[PDB]
Design a protein around this nucleic acid. Structure first.
Length: 54
RNA sequence: GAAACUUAAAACCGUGUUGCACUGCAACCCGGAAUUCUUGCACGUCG
């Protein structure tokens, strides 16, 4: 569906964003855990170091 | 022959360490395995 923000209050505007990421990025599938746990996040396999000092 | 106590009195007693020498001792790791880890833009809004 084309993304529509449901509602008027800012509390349901908050809870829509923290579930779209948790659906589209928690796709690791560890054997015995909750499927929306932080160890299932796909962005744990990318290591971005700092920049050198300018 | 019938009649008159080999009787009376007298501690099996006195003295004397079941005592002298002798280590419940010698040898022995509270030791071997284990990431304070996983997710997160110092950012948004301008008569």
């Amino acid at each position: 569906q084309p993304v529509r923000v449901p509602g008027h209050q800012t509390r349901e505007h908050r809870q829509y964003g923290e579930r779209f990421e948790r659906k589209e990025l928690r796709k690791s599938g560890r054997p015995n855990t909750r499927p929306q746990d932080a160890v299932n996040d796909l962005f744990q396999a990318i290591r971005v170091t700092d920049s050198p000092a300018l």
